């Protein structure tokens, strides 16, 4: 199963934040990198108080179950998620979120996917543009299309 990824990061500096999600997404078991996408600097989708994020896709094989592979990603934004400040732990600054799990449909209390707003989000659709441009969803929609239809901004990259 290609498990496609969206990694997320506001930090002032995520790079060293996104490098070490990479390894870590590497280190799950019965799983590896294909690819991945480039960095990109995108601004924030809500309050613009916010810093920029480090946006970027994923291709993941895996043997693993959806649920499982979800475990895997929550244990990582909790551990590489925050970092330390002198004082005490920053707030957590790592988002993985499942954008697709094979062709497969999913909705639970746990797990939407496909990724529930990724359609309106162009820091999730032009990165994976970029690592599965023929990519078709699982309802025959093509990621191309919804590109096409909706022209979404490209996307500097970081
Ligand atoms: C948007 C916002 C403010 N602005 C941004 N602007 C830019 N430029 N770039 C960004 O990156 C970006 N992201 C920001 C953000 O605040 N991002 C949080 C992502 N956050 C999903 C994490 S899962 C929490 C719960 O969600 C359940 N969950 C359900 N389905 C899935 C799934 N398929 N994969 C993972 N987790 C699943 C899971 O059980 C967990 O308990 C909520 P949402 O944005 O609404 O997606």
Redesign the pocket.
């Known amino acids: 199963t290609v498990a496609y990824i969206?990694?997320?990061?506001?930090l002032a500096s995520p790079l060293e934040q996104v490098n070490a999600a990479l390894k870590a997404l590497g280190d799950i078991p019965e799983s590896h990198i294909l690819t991945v996408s480039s960095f990109y600097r995108?601004?924030?989708?809500?309050?613009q108080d916010?810093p920029?994020?480090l946006?970027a896709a994923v291709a993941l094989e895996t043997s693993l179950a959806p649920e499982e592979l979800?475990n895997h990603?929550?244990r990582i934004?909790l551990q590489q998620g925050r970092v330390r400040k002198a004082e005490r732990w920053g707030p957590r600054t790592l988002?993985?979120?499942?954008?697709l799990?094979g062709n497969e449909v999913?909705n639970?209390?746990?797990?939407?996917?496909?990724?529930?707003?990724?359609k309106n989000?162009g820091?999730?659709l032009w990165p994976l543009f970029e690592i599965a441009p023929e990519l078709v969803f699982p309802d025959g929609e093509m990621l191309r299309q919804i590109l096409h239809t909706r022209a979404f901004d490209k996307l500097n990259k970081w």
């Open positions: 969206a990694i997320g990061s506001n995108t601004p924030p989708l809500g309050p916010q920029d994020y946006n979800l990603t929550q934004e988002d993985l979120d499942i954008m799990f999913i639970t209390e746990r797990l939407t996917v496909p990724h529930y707003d990724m989000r820091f999730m």
